[PDB]
Symmetry: C2
């Protein structure tokens, strides 16, 4: 039920058609919480069946969203990063092959960072907690910081490899 | 087939029984590439069926591992971080509820960081590319940097919330 709360959250600022929900997943929401098309309407069906939407949130849906929002949950198990599995097995690579693999990864992370920086610039063309775009600013700065940090770590490791 | 290359990689430094593979997933490998018990023996069966292991790697298994190691792959889609979905929907929280949620997350990330720091200290009790423990050092420093960066971002956001 990976889309339950994304969808309830989308409806938090008032009614939307299904096309409009589908369209929200093609924009900024789908960079960090991607949906498959085949998941969306079945989730919409379940949510309606559960009393949480009728698409507008019901009182019940608002409560369900709110309860999830404030719930403190343990940090989950680490996300499997296939690149890092390779790094774990680096003993099986020559120094030159390690360099090539890490350099390729560094290029890709820097490239992803430039795409994020373009998105940031668009968003920011005076941020505060009270801004309506604060949630968007949170997911975009989180992604910026994550990729900057990855780039920094890769540069450090390459200085050990090279 | 999420365990294919983890398992081929484990066998890269010579023969192991299944218990010994199961035991490796309970240690450091299972912090960033967790296995379910129910996945391991079925993967072992497939790998044997495919000619990649007989447990020792065959020539074929070594080549398969090597080919995967050097393959340049696109960066995958972002890992769904359920906390970040909440942050995206922060408009539905009061300033006080936002503070409580972010503070709880900050405590948990700092806690995870102390566990990682204990693991680092153990590992490091003169690191180089040539060390046999370089792969372990890579996955542990990556995890350290990732959680330090998360903590830093959380502290920044809390200074905006508070
Ligand atoms: O998590 C990511 O990789 C990307 C997040 C993102 C968030 C908002 C945007 O406007 C663009 C990308
Ligand atoms: O990715 C993680 O969260 C943890 C990784 C980790 C790697 C090596 C260790 O010795 C402990 C934790």
């Amino acid at each position: 039920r990976v889309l339950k709360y994304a969808i309830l959250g989308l409806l938090r600022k008032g009614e939307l058609s299904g096309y409009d929900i589908t369209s929200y997943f093609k924009e900024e929401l789908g960079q960090f919480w991607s949906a498959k098309h085949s998941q969306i309407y079945p989730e919409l069906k379940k949510l309606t069946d559960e009393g949480f939407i009728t698409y507008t949130l019901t009182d019940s849906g608002k409560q369900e969203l709110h309860d999830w929002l404030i719930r403190h949950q343990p940090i989950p198990e680490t996300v499997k990063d296939e690149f890092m599995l390779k790094a774990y097995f680096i003993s099986s690579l020559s120094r030159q092959e390690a360099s090539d693999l890490f350099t390729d990864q560094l290029l890709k992370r820097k490239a992803k960072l430039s795409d994020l920086q373009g998105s940031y610039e668009k968003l920011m063309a005076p941020m505060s907690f009270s801004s309506p775009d604060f949630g968007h600013y949170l997911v975009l700065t989180k992604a910026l910081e994550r990729e900057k940090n990855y780039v920094s770590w890769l540069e450090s490791i390459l200085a050990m490899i090279d």
